[model samples]
Target chain A: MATGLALETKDGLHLFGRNMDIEYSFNQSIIFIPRNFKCVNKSNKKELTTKYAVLGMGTIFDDYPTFADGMNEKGLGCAGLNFPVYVSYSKEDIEGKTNIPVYNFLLWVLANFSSVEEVKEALKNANIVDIPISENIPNTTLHWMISDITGKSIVVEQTKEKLNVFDNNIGVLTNSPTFDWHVANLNQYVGLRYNQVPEFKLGDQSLTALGQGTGLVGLPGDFTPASRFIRVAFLRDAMIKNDKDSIDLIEFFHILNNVAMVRGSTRTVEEKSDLTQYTSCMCLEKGIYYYNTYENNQINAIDMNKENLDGNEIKTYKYNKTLSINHVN
Target chain B: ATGLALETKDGLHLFGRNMDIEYSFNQSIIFIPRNFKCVNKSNKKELTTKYAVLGMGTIFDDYPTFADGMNEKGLGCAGLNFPVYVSYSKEDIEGKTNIPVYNFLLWVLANFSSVEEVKEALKNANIVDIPISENIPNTTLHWMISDITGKSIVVEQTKEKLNVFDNNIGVLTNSPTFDWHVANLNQYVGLRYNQVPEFKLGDQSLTALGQGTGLVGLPGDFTPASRFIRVAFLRDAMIKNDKDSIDLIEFFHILNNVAMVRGSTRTVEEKSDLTQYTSCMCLEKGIYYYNTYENNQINAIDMNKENLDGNEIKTYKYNKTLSINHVN
Candidate 1:
């Protein structure tokens, strides 16, 4: 599990890794979706079993689940969030079926497609109609993000009823009161700076602490969606205004890391687990995926533009059963 | 109050206030000794303080009294623990005393004068006559050092006995020993290449673990001497290796700030009360002296090398009370 956010730069979207926690060697499948590319890779026919899968760019992992950041091959970056809400594909809708597991499907879209339009084109022509396996509990929860070359980042979460897509217009997103509600709630804080409350005079005869700034001041110091949104917004705004040189973008992510993971806070199941599964910050224009583990090591980067993706398709790699299956000794 | 052994490009010897501490200002006197070619009014002295002084240097603050450090001046340095040993004075003797504190400086000056000096005069005035001090603190404390230029550093601790250290290797100073210095810093954050063990064995690993910051660990969160040595060595190495650009000293210091101080540490108050004093990094050639205060404000002075000693000596106005006085 993990949390993240992105910024749409003038030429591309900049993504920063929040936090991540995965159960296995969870690195697989990386593709590039050019600005106008589309894909029809039907995984239904190919039997695959894995716990987690996410979309974005190329593989940023080495011996670890390094990089699966959601930025299109054409510089459109998106990050996947854990959506435990209502998200399921129709088993009865055979024609609409994508044979692959839900988790892997997103990863496929990111690796192969660059923009939302491209993703939409592939989605329209594609058949993600059914799951390859019945009652597959491994890859249950999943959400997707879409960012464009113009510095617009968004998240698309699926509920049982419908899919709600959020735009970068909202300052942030973490775990959540639902993306839309969080977006709407952000209006209450039209002008909130981190750790600072602006003083104002009320209509009454007394001068008050304005407290207007109090509501939005001090970002949520948790791994929740609300907290993540505030943090990303604060950090993005701070960095964008101050960092004139693009070179400092790498360091900007390091500061974001400090606010990304709240260890032992966000819960998963029977045992409390860190919500961060894996962190991936992809620089769209540069085609670089900056990745790191919770262990906090030297950041590793991959140039998606450096190599051809022909040999690195979704079907080329093998998925491990350890991440998905509950193995009893 | 503290001693540090630092190695950096353009080294220096900072006695105190090398690190940030909410304490008093550092007051020190770098005795250039007589006959050294330091212009009475010149820009060279100003440059020495800027690039070399306030810059990278280290500190080692052990118990009671201690220290010895090298700055960004590339200046050779040393400091050692000396306690109630022995000292001599000229005023106490009945005969004409031929020795003085100024004479003790010869070995260093003769070898490393900034420029030319009257060598014949120094040769004539030899063998310093040691006199006895009427009031001995009955405590042993002093130090000695030398530089690459053949200049010597000597600190005589005299109570009733005398222990003269002419020349030595490495840096030796104070209680707890010098060997412990390297060993202590090593245990916390070993060789600079950042390393962090994975949280989990298998699935926990990834394709690309993100940026740098978490891996290179820091120990003792807060301490004056610890930060001194850390900054001195790290800055020195970085500068020497050319890993950092010439003008990056400010950013370099910021990076050290991350690994150094801890917010609101109780020991900080003690440091403030004692060791946390002011510091000045003198960049010799740059003609600037970067003086940083305890509150973290850095002011600079551009010395005109042509008239270096004119205003320089006046600016270093010493508080006679804190000085060691003897009849020359």
Candidate 2:
């Protein structure tokens, strides 16, 4: 399972990231595909050229570029988290609608739309087709958390009913359950706050509160996606710091670490255990992409502004598994 | 599993609780009409009451033994588990109004209209440790009393003395002592409804994972202390959004958080303690709202709507059907 969030700093900065949790490594890297880079849609045998330069965590599959999550030069951010069980994709194209493979949806949105509003309007005529890139490339059920410099984040998921887009007010997205269920679950948590806990009377006598937090006495503490959705939502709100507050880039890393999974924590039926292989954050306004891994605890950065986005050939960077410890003597 | 009382901003006094026991008492909503002669089995005596009462109770040998009840005069009383600290008189005492410990709730419902009046009445009262019969034994208990003025108090008797503490935090559960529970809250002084500040633990960096970061150590168990802390936080931390004094669904939600599930709270004998039913009483309206374990739909028995002037007690069987309203 994976978790993603779109957070906005009080200073007007839009940042997005996801804890890439998986049982095994995919050997992914930061891949930048320049403008006018053409790739063939294996499902349709038709060629589609990029209109905007793109940069994000990706890999070349026989000279073809695919991104699990990424951002565009136009300042649009999108990430596709694992959404199996309830997610659906159309097998064939609907004649009048814009047809794109399920995996290609992220790139299509980032390359075309600059605002969440644009994505919403265009999605009305879009059909997410169930087409794999190759026989070797198996199907992966996915849903996207799309964000932009407009400080707006939207979630897109195609279920048995249809492709639906919901406004992300709490700026959180996790796996499995539908977006509506997560929103409805918020009702039971109406009493949750992050402020002073007043002294209360037990009877004739008054007693004080317990621990560090009483406001969230009923907050769910677990590793499930539903629990993570709530955990991320509340932490994001509380970690905002003082009433007067881009939150420093380090604070964003701290937020992601809260949702990161440690190896051996979640064991599978197979020989593998899920680990947060890497975490990626895109500073939309800065055009700077940041990432850290299980091996190298320190953050690594790749500024798209520093890359040759005008060039034609694709570029790639290592996933940096080497440990570079920062010790203070 | 737990009990909590809340007074709405609009002066709607609400009392809600859960019946968590290893076995059923065959209890249901029973209404005792006004001026009805009640037989006290322990003293083998009879008495007439001024007010009518209705609540969830068991009708034993044609006599009503209330577990909890509310009177027509806008007063309510509930008996809760008080395991190791309950003290009762072994025999009837001279010059004291002696009644079986099990009849305490009924006496309060039939006689008092305010916590003030009850506090004064306790001067001559004696909760005798007398069982109704061989099949039924008296329970170790403490009581919570709330009246129309929105004032609440907890009454407990111990070997040392009889104590009545203000119900400042409108919450109760099976416990050692009320004063101890109040003092035990000192452990959670660090907790708040607000966001937490950044701090380090030892040599490493520590940050809360997500939004509900404020409650780092709020206990999520069925224990008395945990339930007390949780319900107290929720009852005050949350602000009411409606004008109605009685918050129906929200009260149940708080109870549900501390509710005991069968397999989760098993004893040494492999017997489990589960919530048999949950109840909500609107103090001013004389309405009793409840649902049994087998049914999730809430049923109501309004004492104000019934004919309370009658002489005989009314026994209303509970609905156990899995009834859900369909929109279609």
Candidate 3:
């Protein structure tokens, strides 16, 4: 229920992955820097790490193959759980074209763009003409995201012939409920902060709502976009302003933890099976990435001080990657 | 739980809103052609008896204010729903100062541009500096869609702005769910088409194995992105293959009907509540918009032939211009 976190001061940064899978597997994580951070080598493309990019890659109407992650060359970052929904592509874009692979899209962004804006700008020019997936299946639908040392995020989607790119100005994003609802919910909580409600209204409007003396007005905690928006917005603001220099990476993870999916909690209906799977947090400047699987609360780290992401592939495993058995063996 | 539909003819389109509150509350309804059809006048900004668009506009943090309908122009459509997922706005684009109201974004698109032009023009521009919610208590979001005319859709939030999608191609959409799910799910059904499920084996030698059977599994029925991906993928494939075009409009409306929110059904949690206030669908030459309230299914007018849009700015209004307490 808590969070996994760490900050590496040496040649490594921090990466935390958590397996919030109680009944089924769902992963959510965050990457936090223990100190003031900045993406140092802005000019060098060779030094960029895929982990630092904030990627929004999804595939629908195809073979469902994907590589959805937030990586960077600094080894200081995270990817997130694929929440409630997403979209894919159609065969119209690539006539007589093969199916495009999901991983190819994510990896393409990770392999290409460095900063949030860079990915957005680059994608605007790309065309989703090829089929990354096999032939039997022609059209594959999907979207992607990428972020780097600058704390910026970008979403890439291939709907038709063109690649639609978006800049994630707001850092708050979660599952269903729309992305806009979360932003609007932020205001609902504004007036309730620190203001104590009067003991009673003329009739019987209780002063306190939830627990004893607890009067936090409205906080969206659903699995949809609205709830995640509220949690991330609140947590982001609270953690960022915690102190001029707290650089409190741990506190940030805790905030994300609040929005993290927890399966079996009555909060979720029985018919639906899902939980906040794993979480990853990154401090791009320190060249580190941190993640925590649902199985444990420890924030694991990968070092990238060397700049070259080459040969840095962790072959370093997190949870045992479950290979999907295609058919009855 | 999964469906694909289309309307090859004019009157085949069906549209309305659900989640009836009071017994008298009727979901809005309109069958195209009789309601109206497409029209283009040189003096006007292009009015119509129908409109259709599909998208996910942010109403709040994760909730989308989706409105998909077809005015009389033979258009078909759907709108916003949040998938606990990821959508990005330009970080430095200055989104807050000019964001358009989420409710209005779809109307703007439907009122202007065809599927082809909307997509062409929308990609280059960002949204008004719109926040998730404007000063209004419960309205904020983004959207994307496709109409009967073979148009595409895309909408987003960035730095506080809305990026309207203007194109003719649209496919599966999901929240944080990887896009692959949309791509892969397409194999299962297309106008009632079916495919063999990919079966997998268990570790124990004695355990019996079954096909992944997952090819048909639609993830997160409750979330917008989940629903978007499921609905969009299904709807789009049907349109592409020219299968069941007659019922495509009705079927998409029904699909959206299943996903539409009835404010009353929302659990009043957090300091807020979510209501699937309306449901709408549009065809290439026609448009249908609906709103759900306590006892009023008083849907309003507009189609390719006649446009009541500018008559009374608010998206939802009574059949006649009169305001009745309409209390349940």
What are the chain B TM-scores of all models? 0.44, 0.92, 0.49
lDDT of 3 by residue, A37-95 (tens): 22122222112233343322122222122333545453322333333334434434544
lDDT ranking, high to low: 2, 3, 1
Better of 1 and 2 by DockQ: 2
lDDT of 2 by residue, A103-185 (tens): 67888888777778988999998889988776668769998899889878889998888889888877788887898888665
| Runs with alpha carbons beyond 4 Å of true place in candidate 1 | A8-18, A21-72, A94-101, A121-137, A194-216, A241-248, A262-277, A309-329, B1-328
Off by over 4 Å in 2: A41-46, A113-117, A237-246, A263-272, B1-180, B183-328
Q: 2 or 3, which is superior by TM-score?
A: 2
Which tens-of-lDDT digit does each residue in B1-328 have in candidate 1?
A: 2332222334432222232333332433232212223221211211122212211222112101112222233333223223223344433343422333322332322233221222323333322333122231222234444333433334443443333343222223333333344455456443332212235558665221222123223321223234333343443333334332223123223222312111112121222111232233232332222222112223333333224223223233212121111111
Score every model by TM-score.
0.42, 0.59, 0.37
> Can you rank all candidates by TM-score, best first?
2, 1, 3
RMSD after CA superposition, every candidate = 18.5, 10.5, 27.7
Candidate 2: which docking quality band? incorrect
Candidates in descending DockQ order: 2, 1, 3
Worst 10 residues of 3 chain B by lDDT: B199-208
Question: In candidate 2, what are the lDDT values of residues B230-320, reduced to their tens digit?
Answer: 8877766665333354456778877888888869999788898888888888888999998877887888899988888896788888767
Tell me the docking grade of candidate 1: incorrect
User: What class would a CAPRI assessor give candidate 3's docking?
Assistant: incorrect
Q: Chain A TM-score, candidate 1?
A: 0.65
